[PDB]
Amino acid sequence: EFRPEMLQGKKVIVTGASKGIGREMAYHLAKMGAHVVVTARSKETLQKVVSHCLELGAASAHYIAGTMEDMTFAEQFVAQAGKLMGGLDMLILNHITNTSLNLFHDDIHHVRKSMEVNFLSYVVLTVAALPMLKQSNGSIVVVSSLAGKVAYPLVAAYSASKFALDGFFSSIRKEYSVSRVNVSITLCVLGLIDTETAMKAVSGIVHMQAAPKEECALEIIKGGALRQEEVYYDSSRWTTLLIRNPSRKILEELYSTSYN
Amino acid sequence: EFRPEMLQGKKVIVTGASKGIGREMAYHLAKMGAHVVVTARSKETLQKVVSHCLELGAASAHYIAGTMEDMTFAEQFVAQAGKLMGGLDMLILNHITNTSLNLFHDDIHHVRKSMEVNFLSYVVLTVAALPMLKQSNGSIVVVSSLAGKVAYPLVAAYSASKFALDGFFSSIRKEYSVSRVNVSITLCVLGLIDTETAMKAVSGIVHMQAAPKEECALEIIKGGALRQEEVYYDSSRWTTLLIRNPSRKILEELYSTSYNMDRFIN
Ligand SMILES: NC(=O)c1ccc[n+]([C@@H]2O[C@H](COP(=O)([O-])OP(=O)(O)OC[C@H]3O[C@@H](n4cnc5c(N)ncnc54)[C@H](OP(=O)(O)O)[C@@H]3O)[C@@H](O)[C@H]2O)c1
Ligand SMILES: NC(=O)c1ccc[n+]([C@@H]2O[C@H](COP(=O)([O-])OP(=O)(O)OC[C@H]3O[C@@H](n4cnc5c(N)ncnc54)[C@H](OP(=O)(O)O)[C@@H]3O)[C@@H](O)[C@H]2O)c1
Ligand SMILES: O=C(N[C@@H]1[C@@H]2C[C@@H]3C[C@H]1C[C@@](O)(C3)C2)c1sc(OCCO)nc1C1CC1
Ligand SMILES: O=C(N[C@@H]1[C@@H]2C[C@@H]3C[C@H]1C[C@@](O)(C3)C2)c1sc(OCCO)nc1C1CC1
C-alpha cells in the first residue's frame, strides 16, 4: 500500500540525523524526492549527510546544528526549518542523549538529562511544529524502543523517557480524535538496531541479534506515511508478534463514551 | 495472606498525605500501629493528619512540610524522616503537582512541572531512601494511575509523568534482581478515586464511576506489605482484568537471560 511517491516533495524534519537510523531516514527521504531538514550537534557530520541527500535525489536538503538540551534552540529550529521548506508535512523525532548499559545508582543527573533530551524537547518541538502540521494534515513520528514498552535492566533513565513518550503522544492522539485535529502520531517501537552507537554499547553485554538500520529507517518512514498509530520493528518475528497489546486498546475504547 | 499486624511497628513515609488517598493511607497505617512521617506543602493540614494518626493508634506520627518541586527539600526530608523513626521500612510515593482536566495546547510549564514533581522528585526520594531501605530489606510503593498504563484524553502531561514512573521503577526492579537488592517495588495502577480533588476536576467533563479513597488506600498498603509488583484498583471488574499485560512479562523473561551480568555482579 506504501509507494515512494507519497514522500515526493514532502517537507520533512528528522532529528538525530547525523548518524544511525536518523541518517538512514534522511537518505531514504532523499531518494523519495522529499525536502529534508536534519539536525544533530555535529555540523560537520550534518554537512556530509546533507551533501549525500542531494546526491541521492532530495528535492532540497538542509541542516541546523545545535543541542536539544536547549529548549529555545529546539523551539526555534522548527520555525527555521519550516521557513526553509515553506511548511512542514512530517516531523520525525529521533534524537536521544548519550547512554550506556549500566546499573542505575545515584544518577539523577542522567535521569534529568534523559528526560530533557529524549522527552521534553520532543514536546517543545511538537508545540512549535503543530501550527504547520495542522495546515498540512501532517505527521508526527516518535521514535521509541521496546524498552519504552517493556522493562529491561541497564536502561532505567532511558526507559523512563521512552515510556513518557508513549504516555504523552498516545494521550495527545486521543485528544486529536475528539477535537478532530488531522495530525497523525506514529509511535515506533524498535528492538535492537545495528547502529555504531548501539553495537559499541552492547558488545560483551547483550546477546540479542540486531536488525539492519537501513530497513528500520524505511519501516519507520512507511509507517508514518501510512499514518499507522504504532510501528513495530525487531529482528525477531516472535517479539514483533508479542509486542501488540489488545487489552490496552479495548480499555481505551471502553472509556471513549466517558468524555462529554 | 495479608494481616494488619504486618505493618505494626514498621517505619513508613507517605508523601502527599495532607488529604485524599495519601491521608487515608496514613490513617490506615496508624490504625495498624505503624510509625508514620507524612509530608505535603501545607503544615496546617499535615498537623491535623498527624494528631488523628496518634488517636487512631500510630506507634508515632510526625510531619515535615515542604514542596517536592524542591529537590534538596526532597533529599533532606528523607534523612530527617529516617532520624525520627530510627530507620525506614517503606517509602510511599503518592504526591503530584495540582492538575486539572484540559486538552493539551502549549503548556510546556505544566509538562515540565509534572515531570519534575510527579516523576523526578520520586527518583530523588528513592535515592535518599535506598540506604535505609537496603538495610531493612524494605519497600517502595509508587502511586500511579490507569492513565500511566493506557491512553486517555485531557491528561497528556500527567500521563507522561505516570508512564515514566512505570518505565523507571520497573527497569530498576529488573536491576534489583541482578544486584539482588532486597527492595520491593509496587506500582499501584489506580482508576478514578473519589478524592475531593478528583471529584472537582471531573464534574462536567468526564462521566466515570469513582472508587472509594479509603478502600483504595488499604489496597495500596496490602499490596506493598505483600511486596507485590503491581496493585490494581478501579471500580470496574472489567478494567482490573484488562489492565494486566502478560505478553509484557513474557517479553521481559525471554530477554532476562540475554544479558551477561558478570561485570555487573562481581
Ligand atoms: N540503535 C538501537 O539499538 C535502538 C533500539 C531501539 C530504539 N532506538 C531509537 O532509535 C533512535 C536513534 O537511535 P540510534 O541508535 O540511531 O542513535 P545514534 O546513532 O547514537 O544517534 C543519536 C543521534 O542523536 C544526536 N544527538 C545526541 N545528543 C544530542 C543532543 N543533546 N541534541 C541533539 N542531538 C543529539 C546524535 O548526533 P550528535 O552527537 O552530533 O548530536 C545522533 O545524530 C533513538 O530515539 C533510540 O531511542 C535505537
Ligand atoms: N484521585 C484519583 O482519581 C486518582 C486516580 C488515579 C491515580 N491517582 C493518584 O493517586 C495519588 C494521590 O492522588 P489524590 O487524588 O489523593 O490527591 P490529592 O487529594 O489532591 O492530594 C495531593 C497531595 O499532594 C500534595 N502536594 C501537591 N503539590 C505538592 C508539592 N509540590 N509538593 C509536595 N506535595 C504536594 C497535596 O498537599 P499540598 O498542596 O498541601 O502540597 C496533597 O497532600 C496521585 O499520585 C494521583 O496521581 C489519583
Ligand atoms: O533501546 C534499546 N537499546 C538502545 C541501544 C543500546 C544501548 C541502550 C539503548 C540506547 C543506546 O544508545 C545504547 C542504543 C533496546 S531495544 C531492545 O530490545 C531487544 C529486542 O530486540 N533492547 C535494548 C537494550 C539492549 C537492552
Ligand atoms: O488519574 C486519573 N485522574 C486524576 C484525578 C482527576 C483529575 C485527573 C487526574 C489528576 C487529578 O488530580 C485531576 C485527580 C484517571 S484514572 C482514570 O481511569 C479511568 C477509570 O476510572 N481516568 C483518569 C482521568 C479522567 C481521565
XYZ file of C-alpha atoms and ligand atoms in Angstrom:
674
model
C 0.000 0.000 0.000
C 3.106 2.193 0.506
C 4.523 3.934 -2.552
C 7.738 6.077 -2.504
C 5.947 8.963 -4.330
C 3.911 9.562 -1.129
C 7.036 11.299 0.238
C 7.921 13.149 -3.000
C 8.045 16.889 -2.450
C 7.042 16.372 1.205
C 8.565 18.726 3.775
C 10.212 16.517 6.420
C 12.218 17.235 9.612
C 14.482 14.485 11.003
C 16.253 14.932 14.353
C 19.402 12.980 15.427
C 20.014 12.500 11.712
C 23.795 12.903 11.615
C 24.199 9.154 12.250
C 22.403 5.842 12.818
C 18.712 5.379 11.961
C 18.221 9.150 11.680
C 20.799 9.447 8.921
C 19.283 6.412 7.191
C 15.827 8.053 7.292
C 17.271 11.187 5.734
C 18.837 9.032 2.964
C 15.560 7.218 2.221
C 13.619 10.524 2.225
C 16.203 11.985 -0.199
C 15.784 9.065 -2.545
C 11.953 9.602 -2.474
C 12.461 13.226 -3.502
C 11.389 14.839 -0.234
C 12.541 18.155 1.133
C 14.605 17.386 4.304
C 15.915 19.444 7.232
C 18.105 17.429 9.565
C 19.550 18.241 12.966
C 22.185 16.945 15.471
C 25.019 18.717 17.344
C 27.813 17.965 14.784
C 27.502 20.495 11.928
C 30.405 18.891 10.118
C 28.715 15.447 10.057
C 25.381 17.029 9.132
C 27.146 18.736 6.154
C 28.171 15.291 4.807
C 24.660 13.846 5.360
C 23.076 16.778 3.551
C 25.502 16.557 0.562
C 24.684 12.866 0.190
C 20.958 13.588 0.424
C 21.357 15.928 -2.590
C 23.362 13.242 -4.474
C 20.543 10.798 -3.744
C 17.809 12.986 -5.342
C 16.457 15.091 -2.450
C 14.265 17.955 -3.663
C 16.290 20.098 -1.156
C 18.326 19.152 1.975
C 19.463 21.451 4.786
C 20.834 21.209 8.329
C 20.552 23.163 11.583
C 23.185 22.207 14.168
C 22.542 22.501 17.918
C 21.655 20.699 21.110
C 18.175 19.525 22.068
C 19.263 20.181 25.707
C 18.392 23.785 24.814
C 14.618 24.198 24.552
C 14.948 27.565 22.836
C 17.284 26.145 20.156
C 14.556 23.412 19.858
C 11.562 25.780 19.522
C 13.471 27.971 17.033
C 14.735 25.015 14.981
C 11.203 24.049 13.902
C 10.385 27.644 12.811
C 13.639 27.987 10.915
C 13.092 24.548 9.337
C 9.530 25.384 8.192
C 10.673 28.700 6.685
C 13.399 26.920 4.729
C 10.957 24.413 3.344
C 7.884 26.718 3.133
C 5.898 24.477 5.533
C 6.062 21.042 7.286
C 4.416 17.646 6.431
C 6.321 15.327 8.738
C 8.219 15.731 11.972
C 10.426 12.721 12.740
C 11.539 12.925 16.416
C 14.503 10.539 16.713
C 17.368 12.128 18.712
C 18.471 10.871 22.207
C 21.158 11.846 24.701
C 24.304 9.678 25.028
C 23.698 6.465 27.071
C 25.344 3.199 28.137
C 24.143 -0.118 29.650
C 24.816 0.359 33.335
C 23.001 -0.136 36.633
C 21.322 2.921 37.984
C 22.979 4.074 41.177
C 22.837 7.685 42.266
C 22.398 9.273 38.815
C 19.635 11.896 38.973
C 21.749 13.913 36.556
C 21.481 11.269 33.849
C 17.753 10.793 34.620
C 17.126 14.531 34.351
C 19.160 14.885 31.134
C 17.454 11.832 29.562
C 14.055 13.400 30.377
C 15.035 16.804 28.965
C 16.614 15.484 25.738
C 14.592 12.356 24.979
C 11.229 13.759 26.161
C 10.785 17.457 26.963
C 12.480 18.570 23.704
C 10.139 16.289 21.748
C 7.187 18.096 23.346
C 8.776 21.514 22.627
C 9.373 20.518 19.005
C 5.780 19.287 18.668
C 4.330 22.537 20.106
C 6.458 24.557 17.573
C 5.532 22.199 14.680
C 1.816 21.902 15.330
C 0.507 25.060 13.503
C 2.293 23.943 10.299
C 1.244 20.298 10.699
C -2.377 21.413 11.181
C -2.110 23.404 7.920
C -0.814 20.345 6.022
C -2.587 17.462 7.835
C 0.917 16.293 8.682
C 2.564 13.526 10.700
C 4.405 13.284 13.958
C 6.759 10.278 14.013
C 8.037 9.461 17.533
C 10.957 7.073 17.621
C 10.736 4.864 20.656
C 12.065 1.425 21.711
C 10.937 -1.907 23.090
C 12.411 -0.538 26.357
C 9.646 2.063 26.061
C 7.014 -0.746 26.308
C 8.627 -3.428 28.452
C 11.099 -3.294 31.435
C 14.811 -4.216 30.870
C 17.721 -3.727 33.282
C 20.573 -1.276 32.487
C 18.433 1.398 30.765
C 16.300 2.848 33.613
C 16.514 6.593 32.771
C 16.312 5.773 29.049
C 13.223 3.578 29.636
C 11.552 6.348 31.722
C 11.987 8.825 28.861
C 10.626 6.315 26.262
C 7.654 5.250 28.435
C 6.978 9.061 28.882
C 6.831 9.485 25.087
C 4.208 6.743 24.929
C 2.086 8.373 27.689
C 2.285 11.880 26.226
C 1.876 11.225 22.479
C -0.760 8.470 22.931
C -2.886 10.836 25.052
C -2.439 13.702 22.562
C -3.581 11.224 19.876
C -6.829 10.531 21.768
C -7.307 14.286 22.064
C -6.928 14.597 18.303
C -9.692 12.115 17.794
C -12.035 14.197 19.990
C -11.159 17.626 18.532
C -10.681 16.106 15.073
C -7.196 17.593 14.579
C -5.964 15.728 11.498
C -2.326 15.226 12.620
C -1.294 11.554 12.780
C 1.018 10.278 15.530
C 3.112 7.144 14.917
C 4.992 5.593 17.835
C 7.901 3.449 16.612
C 8.618 0.504 18.883
C 12.121 -0.699 17.915
C 14.140 -3.695 19.062
C 17.935 -3.666 18.920
C 19.161 -1.934 15.746
C 22.714 -2.333 14.400
C 23.856 1.327 14.613
C 27.504 2.040 15.605
C 26.377 3.580 18.918
C 24.218 0.592 19.806
C 26.787 -2.035 18.689
C 29.557 -0.447 20.789
C 27.284 -0.042 23.873
C 26.049 -3.612 23.602
C 29.355 -5.600 22.911
C 30.272 -8.059 25.613
C 26.957 -7.468 27.363
C 23.952 -8.246 25.205
C 23.431 -11.364 23.089
C 20.401 -10.340 21.126
C 20.678 -10.090 17.337
C 20.421 -6.503 15.932
C 18.165 -5.593 12.974
C 19.662 -3.723 9.979
C 19.337 0.073 10.393
C 18.515 0.787 6.702
C 15.397 -1.343 6.717
C 14.490 0.060 10.183
C 14.637 3.580 8.838
C 12.499 2.521 5.894
C 9.854 0.798 8.082
C 9.585 3.965 10.220
C 9.017 6.171 7.152
C 6.473 3.699 5.684
C 4.569 3.651 8.950
C 4.485 7.434 9.239
C 3.485 7.943 5.611
C 0.676 5.419 6.024
C -0.165 7.149 9.367
C -0.057 3.914 11.457
C -0.542 4.552 15.218
C 2.404 2.329 16.018
C 5.179 0.632 14.052
C 6.907 -2.447 15.489
C 10.322 -3.430 14.146
C 12.636 -6.152 15.500
C 14.980 -8.803 14.100
C 12.727 -11.439 15.692
C 9.328 -12.307 14.247
C 8.401 -13.608 17.719
C 8.867 -10.332 19.630
C 7.025 -8.470 16.871
C 4.024 -10.775 17.455
C 4.233 -10.362 21.228
C 4.590 -6.563 21.256
C 0.845 -5.871 20.457
C -1.499 -5.126 23.371
C -5.194 -5.694 22.631
C -6.100 -5.160 26.312
C -4.858 -1.565 26.257
C -6.819 -0.869 23.041
C -10.138 -2.238 24.443
C -9.630 -0.452 27.730
C -9.010 2.884 25.939
C -12.096 2.351 23.796
C -14.173 1.267 26.820
C -13.773 4.870 28.033
C -14.383 6.744 24.730
C -18.035 7.319 25.797
C -16.902 8.801 29.166
C -15.919 12.270 27.823
C -18.566 14.947 27.122
C -2.438 -13.695 53.288
C -2.437 -10.047 54.457
C -2.729 -9.286 58.148
C -2.858 -5.706 59.550
C -0.132 -6.795 62.027
C 2.264 -6.798 59.073
C 2.552 -3.009 59.451
C 2.775 -2.917 63.229
C 5.950 -1.097 64.226
C 7.006 -0.506 60.556
C 8.718 2.782 59.620
C 6.715 4.372 56.759
C 6.907 7.654 54.827
C 3.792 8.752 52.977
C 4.108 11.755 50.627
C 1.161 13.916 49.546
C -0.542 12.854 52.809
C -2.387 16.033 53.867
C -5.530 14.813 52.054
C -7.012 12.237 49.664
C -5.539 8.780 49.171
C -2.257 9.782 50.930
C -4.121 10.871 54.080
C -6.231 7.672 54.123
C -3.043 5.627 53.771
C -1.576 7.446 56.798
C -4.781 6.743 58.830
C -4.797 3.069 57.879
C -1.066 2.824 58.823
C -1.775 4.470 62.164
C -4.622 2.022 62.997
C -2.167 -0.803 62.240
C 0.289 0.689 64.721
C 2.970 1.722 62.243
C 5.360 4.678 62.659
C 4.422 7.444 60.160
C 6.120 10.531 58.741
C 3.787 12.443 56.436
C 4.588 15.273 54.017
C 2.873 17.930 51.779
C 3.315 21.743 51.402
C 0.630 22.661 53.942
C 1.793 22.469 57.544
C -1.745 23.257 58.836
C -3.409 20.256 57.172
C -0.427 17.918 57.923
C -0.642 18.662 61.716
C -4.279 17.614 61.734
C -3.472 14.382 59.931
C -0.722 13.638 62.500
C -2.967 14.272 65.523
C -5.593 11.952 64.236
C -2.883 9.389 63.351
C -1.915 9.335 67.070
C -5.618 8.949 68.161
C -6.040 6.052 65.718
C -3.011 4.359 67.343
C 0.191 5.073 65.404
C 3.345 3.954 67.263
C 4.428 7.526 66.389
C 3.378 10.181 63.820
C 5.295 13.224 62.565
C 5.131 15.607 59.656
C 7.572 17.678 57.642
C 6.199 20.403 55.355
C 7.794 21.361 52.049
C 7.469 21.254 48.303
C 8.581 18.370 46.106
C 9.422 20.910 43.358
C 12.467 21.450 45.593
C 14.868 18.518 45.124
C 17.044 19.487 48.094
C 13.921 19.512 50.263
C 13.031 16.017 48.841
C 16.535 14.678 49.648
C 16.735 16.307 53.152
C 13.186 15.203 54.013
C 14.110 11.514 53.675
C 17.155 11.911 56.005
C 15.082 13.735 58.604
C 12.167 11.259 58.415
C 14.623 8.400 58.963
C 16.139 10.133 62.035
C 12.675 10.473 63.509
C 11.766 6.847 63.158
C 15.189 5.250 63.582
C 15.099 3.791 60.063
C 12.715 3.261 57.154
C 10.793 0.130 56.017
C 8.511 1.624 53.336
C 8.577 4.703 51.146
C 5.120 5.526 49.865
C 5.380 7.932 46.897
C 1.982 9.494 46.421
C 2.237 13.293 45.812
C 1.649 15.016 42.461
C 1.543 18.613 41.266
C -2.012 20.053 41.070
C -3.529 19.096 37.736
C -6.871 19.733 36.128
C -8.556 18.203 33.051
C -7.651 20.069 29.863
C -6.683 19.484 26.267
C -3.018 19.986 25.636
C -2.021 23.224 23.858
C 1.303 24.833 24.564
C 1.616 24.382 28.355
C 5.308 23.421 28.498
C 5.471 24.854 32.051
C 2.854 22.293 33.142
C 4.617 19.493 31.208
C 7.922 20.278 32.948
C 6.294 20.750 36.364
C 4.525 17.414 36.037
C 7.785 15.602 35.132
C 9.639 17.335 37.979
C 7.160 16.811 40.765
C 5.321 13.618 39.644
C 8.451 11.750 38.443
C 11.912 13.261 39.159
C 11.177 14.042 42.830
C 10.198 10.370 43.189
C 13.638 9.339 41.847
C 15.422 11.806 44.190
C 13.413 10.445 47.184
C 14.222 6.855 46.215
C 17.980 7.662 46.018
C 17.868 9.291 49.511
C 15.859 6.399 50.986
C 17.772 3.460 49.376
C 20.495 3.061 52.046
C 17.836 2.753 54.788
C 15.631 0.554 52.567
C 18.578 -1.770 51.709
C 19.405 -2.182 55.408
C 15.793 -3.039 56.333
C 15.056 -5.027 53.096
C 12.183 -2.546 52.714
C 9.605 -1.475 50.100
C 8.897 1.323 47.670
C 5.271 1.989 46.789
C 4.733 4.127 43.692
C 1.243 5.589 43.256
C 0.385 5.646 39.571
C -2.818 5.649 37.513
C -4.713 3.868 34.717
C -3.525 6.917 32.692
C 0.004 5.623 33.447
C -0.748 2.328 31.582
C -3.288 3.323 28.944
C -4.167 6.474 26.918
C -6.966 8.909 27.881
C -7.593 12.440 26.616
C -7.196 15.593 28.832
C -4.205 14.325 30.885
C -1.208 14.343 28.477
C 1.462 15.748 30.832
C 0.090 13.783 33.818
C 0.025 10.575 31.737
C 3.601 11.248 30.606
C 4.802 11.605 34.206
C 2.951 8.383 35.279
C 4.174 6.401 32.281
C 7.738 7.488 33.181
C 7.299 6.053 36.710
C 6.486 2.587 35.199
C 9.497 2.535 32.876
C 11.849 3.825 35.547
C 10.780 1.743 38.559
C 10.064 -1.458 36.566
C 13.513 -1.128 34.973
C 15.097 -0.674 38.465
C 13.028 -3.686 39.619
C 14.836 -5.797 36.995
C 18.167 -4.319 38.150
C 17.423 -5.387 41.753
C 17.060 -8.996 40.576
C 20.602 -8.670 39.156
C 22.227 -6.802 42.073
C 19.928 -8.759 44.496
C 18.913 -5.667 46.399
C 16.009 -6.758 48.656
C 13.818 -3.704 47.978
C 10.372 -4.432 46.568
C 8.781 -2.046 44.069
C 4.966 -1.929 43.898
C 3.401 0.135 41.107
C -0.209 0.969 42.031
C -2.391 1.399 38.937
C -5.482 3.330 40.075
C -8.792 4.162 38.370
C -10.848 7.259 39.286
C -10.839 7.666 43.074
C -13.458 9.706 44.997
C -10.897 12.161 46.449
C -12.074 15.804 46.780
C -9.500 16.938 44.165
C -10.679 14.406 41.568
C -14.463 14.809 42.162
C -13.982 18.593 41.496
C -11.717 18.164 38.485
C -14.112 15.687 36.858
C -17.520 17.469 37.162
C -18.977 18.281 33.736
C -16.022 16.970 31.753
C -15.998 13.214 32.371
C -18.583 10.610 33.404
C -16.808 7.772 35.259
C -17.673 5.853 38.393
C -15.210 6.811 41.182
C -13.922 4.198 43.687
C -13.682 4.982 47.480
C -10.400 6.541 48.676
C -10.367 4.619 51.974
C -10.518 1.164 50.462
C -8.146 2.298 47.664
C -5.650 3.253 50.420
C -5.992 -0.112 52.165
C -5.373 -1.933 48.848
C -2.136 0.033 48.250
C -0.919 -0.868 51.778
C -1.914 -4.545 51.317
C -0.064 -4.724 48.005
C 3.030 -3.008 49.407
C 3.152 -5.152 52.560
C 2.871 -8.266 50.429
C 5.689 -6.927 48.227
C 3.534 -7.288 45.085
C 4.810 -5.904 41.807
C 1.538 -4.219 40.817
C -1.698 -3.314 42.627
C -4.785 -2.593 40.512
C -7.626 -0.533 41.917
C -10.635 0.525 39.883
C -14.437 0.368 40.269
C -14.856 -1.874 37.163
C -14.111 -5.612 37.429
C -13.506 -5.444 33.672
C -10.705 -2.900 33.800
C -8.981 -4.917 36.537
C -8.776 -7.852 34.032
C -7.738 -5.809 31.000
C -5.011 -3.911 32.938
C -2.667 -6.934 33.310
C -0.157 -7.320 30.421
C 1.063 -10.944 30.240
C 2.864 -10.558 26.933
C 4.975 -7.775 28.554
C 6.062 -10.205 31.312
C 6.804 -12.903 28.691
C 8.943 -10.490 26.688
C 10.756 -9.449 29.880
C 11.633 -13.025 30.952
C 12.556 -14.083 27.405
C 15.165 -11.285 27.388
C 16.292 -11.553 31.028
C 18.885 -14.244 30.142
C 20.190 -12.375 27.083
C 22.422 -10.147 29.190
C 25.835 -11.101 30.567
C 25.688 -9.777 34.144
C 29.228 -10.884 35.178
C 30.671 -7.371 35.073
C 27.627 -6.007 36.997
C 27.643 -8.643 39.761
C 31.395 -9.121 40.507
N 20.080 1.571 17.954
C 19.221 0.806 18.684
O 19.524 -0.333 19.022
C 17.884 1.323 19.065
C 16.949 0.459 19.637
C 15.686 0.955 19.952
C 15.413 2.276 19.714
N 16.319 3.095 19.187
C 15.948 4.506 19.000
O 16.334 4.961 17.702
C 16.642 6.386 17.780
C 18.035 6.673 17.236
O 18.935 5.674 17.717
P 20.404 5.489 17.081
O 20.951 4.126 17.606
O 20.322 5.592 15.572
O 21.315 6.675 17.646
P 22.795 7.263 17.305
O 23.445 6.587 16.079
O 23.612 7.215 18.579
O 22.478 8.789 17.006
C 21.964 9.645 18.024
C 21.617 10.916 17.273
O 21.205 11.921 18.226
C 22.096 13.066 18.121
N 22.223 13.655 19.466
C 22.846 13.171 20.572
N 22.730 14.009 21.583
C 22.046 15.102 21.170
C 21.625 16.339 21.729
N 21.918 16.652 23.014
N 20.980 17.221 20.971
C 20.716 16.984 19.704
N 21.049 15.838 19.152
C 21.716 14.887 19.814
C 23.404 12.476 17.579
O 24.235 13.415 16.876
P 25.218 14.407 17.639
O 26.053 13.618 18.708
O 26.147 15.189 16.639
O 24.360 15.474 18.411
C 22.877 11.431 16.577
O 22.588 12.032 15.310
C 16.621 6.816 19.294
O 15.419 7.537 19.569
C 16.645 5.447 20.017
O 15.966 5.523 21.283
C 17.535 2.661 18.857
N -7.939 10.783 42.691
C -7.926 9.998 41.586
O -8.911 9.839 40.895
C -6.713 9.292 41.177
C -6.783 8.356 40.149
C -5.630 7.671 39.784
C -4.450 7.964 40.431
N -4.402 8.873 41.387
C -3.100 9.094 42.028
O -3.224 8.952 43.450
C -2.248 9.822 44.094
C -2.893 10.755 45.113
O -3.985 11.441 44.492
P -5.121 12.257 45.319
O -6.358 12.270 44.421
O -5.368 11.559 46.674
O -4.500 13.675 45.556
P -4.911 14.904 46.497
O -6.022 14.505 47.495
O -5.285 16.098 45.681
O -3.579 15.203 47.304
C -2.384 15.622 46.682
C -1.336 15.622 47.791
O -0.064 16.077 47.275
C 0.299 17.292 47.936
N 1.048 18.165 47.022
C 0.605 18.932 45.971
N 1.621 19.554 45.427
C 2.765 19.240 46.110
C 4.120 19.586 46.034
N 4.606 20.431 45.073
N 4.985 19.078 46.923
C 4.584 18.250 47.875
N 3.320 17.893 47.951
C 2.398 18.354 47.123
C -1.023 17.889 48.451
O -0.808 18.767 49.555
P -0.262 20.268 49.354
O -0.964 21.001 48.159
O -0.577 20.926 50.732
O 1.253 20.255 48.983
C -1.751 16.606 48.904
O -1.222 16.115 50.135
C -1.548 10.616 42.959
O -0.304 10.000 42.611
C -2.543 10.502 41.796
O -1.869 10.605 40.541
C -5.475 9.546 41.777
O 16.608 0.727 23.077
C 17.385 -0.196 23.231
N 18.702 -0.025 23.221
C 19.373 1.251 22.996
C 20.646 0.906 22.212
C 21.629 0.109 23.109
C 22.026 0.931 24.351
C 20.750 1.239 25.141
C 19.721 1.973 24.294
C 20.298 3.307 23.825
C 21.606 3.066 23.022
O 22.122 4.380 22.662
C 22.621 2.303 23.893
C 21.319 2.225 21.756
C 16.939 -1.610 23.340
S 15.640 -2.104 22.281
C 15.923 -3.677 22.918
O 15.145 -4.726 22.522
C 15.784 -6.009 22.363
C 14.972 -6.909 21.436
O 15.444 -6.695 20.103
N 16.834 -3.851 23.900
C 17.509 -2.706 24.181
C 18.580 -2.583 25.200
C 19.692 -3.593 24.921
C 18.678 -3.862 26.036
O -5.647 9.589 37.135
C -6.767 9.904 36.745
N -7.344 11.049 37.146
C -6.693 12.022 38.051
C -7.738 12.616 39.028
C -8.784 13.523 38.330
C -8.066 14.607 37.510
C -7.103 13.932 36.508
C -6.034 13.146 37.256
C -5.292 14.043 38.308
C -6.298 14.657 39.294
O -5.633 15.443 40.321
C -7.261 15.514 38.464
C -7.046 13.557 40.029
C -7.573 8.975 35.919
S -7.556 7.291 36.369
C -8.740 7.083 35.098
O -9.201 5.820 34.789
C -10.497 5.574 34.229
C -11.293 4.575 35.096
O -11.626 5.087 36.403
N -9.099 8.179 34.363
C -8.498 9.317 34.811
C -8.672 10.697 34.271
C -10.114 11.025 33.906
C -9.121 10.614 32.812
